[PDB]
Amino acid sequence: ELRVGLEESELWLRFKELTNEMIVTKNGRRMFPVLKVNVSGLDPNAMYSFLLDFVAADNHRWKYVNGEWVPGGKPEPQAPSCVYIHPDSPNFGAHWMKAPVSFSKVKLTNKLNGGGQIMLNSLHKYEPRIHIVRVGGPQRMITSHCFPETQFIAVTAYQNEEITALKIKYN
Numbered sequence: 376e377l378r379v380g381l382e383e384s385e386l387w388l389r390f391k392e393l394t395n396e397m398i399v400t401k402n403g404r405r406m407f408p409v410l411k412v413n414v415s416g417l418d419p420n421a422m423y424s425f426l427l428d429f430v431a432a433d434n435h436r437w438k439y440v441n442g443e444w445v446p447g448g449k450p451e452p453q454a455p456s457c458v459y460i461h462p463d464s465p466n467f468g469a470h471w472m473k474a475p476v477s478f479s480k481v482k483l484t485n486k487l488n489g490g491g492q493i494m495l496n497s498l499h500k501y502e503p504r505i506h507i508v509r510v511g512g513p514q515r516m517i518t519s520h521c522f523p524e525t526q527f528i529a530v531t532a533y534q535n536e537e538i539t540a541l542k543i544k545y546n
């Protein structure tokens with residue numbers, strides 16, 4: 376059985392209990408914490424690409440009102456985010472299983488842009504998701520996994536100073 380686990384869940388949960396925020400910029404900002412995933416049960420000899428996307432967790436716009444995040448009343452359907460291909464892709468199962476798979480180079484933007492960067496809507500809430508795609512073999516297969524612990528709201532600047540403090544303390 377293919378097993379997907381979150382590395383450093385301890386720390387993600389401190390961010391989540393405060394409501395996590397991730398900065399987006401026109402050029403694209405790297406994430407902290409970085410999503411790092413433990414994977415076991417791949418075929419060491421099979422070929423895989425690791426893909427990352429962001430599910431809109433709800434259909435609403437969020438605002439930080441009197442020290443508290445609150446959703447708008449006017450949902451709109453959220454078109455799915457673009458997919459980020461891990462730079463190590465494509466690679467053997469052994470490669471992916473020898474150390475946590477770290478998405479350190481993904482950049483989150485608010486503007487449709489050249490390449491690499493993933494465009495999110497500011498003040499929407501997102502749930503990171505990976506796809507593990509068996510490639511080059513005869514039998515294409517996909518395994519997907521969500522990480523509720525890594526939910527955040529996309530912001531152009533931090534609203535909750537308790538987030539600002541955690542980000543610095545642990546970077």
Ligand SMILES: Cn1cc(CNC(=O)c2ccco2)cn1
Nearest residue numbers: 424460461462463464465508510
């Ligand atoms: C780092 N990098 C690798 C590619 C090639 N593409 C892939 O591996 C791919 C696309 C869909 C599933 O897998 C593009 N960027």
